[PDB]
Amino acid sequence: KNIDGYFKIYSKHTPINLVRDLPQGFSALEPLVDLPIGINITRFQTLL
Amino acid sequence: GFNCYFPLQSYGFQPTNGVGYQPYRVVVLSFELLHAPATVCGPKKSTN
Numbered sequence: 684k685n686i687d688g689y690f691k692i693y694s695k696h697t698p699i700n701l702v703r704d705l706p707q708g709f710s711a712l713e714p715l716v717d718l719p720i721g722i723n724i725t726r727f728q729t730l731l
Numbered sequence: 732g733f734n735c736y737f738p739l740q741s742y743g744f745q746p747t748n749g750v751g752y753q754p755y756r757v758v759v760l761s762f763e764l765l766h767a768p769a770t771v772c773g774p775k776k777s778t779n
């Protein structure tokens with residue numbers, strides 16, 4: 684997410700034994716890095 | 732060629748050369764005003 688010129692990333696690495704879909708349950712996400720990018724962001728793509 | 736010379740040149744640097752001709756190491760620390768959230772900042776001291 685982007686807020687106040689701040690780029691925020693929250694992450695979680697829970698072990699999942701269901702390969703079909705995300706399992707029913709709850710696991711909160713802890714923040715990792717809050718780097719002050721300040722570049723307005725409107726698009727996103729993923730690498731492999 | 733006629734009225735033609737290499738724009739680049741090298742000056743012989745010697746320890747016994749004049750002080751004016753002696754090379755000095757020069758660093759310029761260009762700054763800029765606070766138009767955005769600051770990232771590089773001076774250390775902030777903390778009391779006991």
Ligand SMILES: *[C@@H]1O[C@H](CO)[C@@H](O)[C@H](O)[C@H]1NC(C)=O
Binds near residue numbers: 721722723
């Ligand atoms: C948001 O993006 C716009 C262009 O769509 C830009 O003018 C503006 O400065 C941006 N805001 C920030 C905080 O980067």
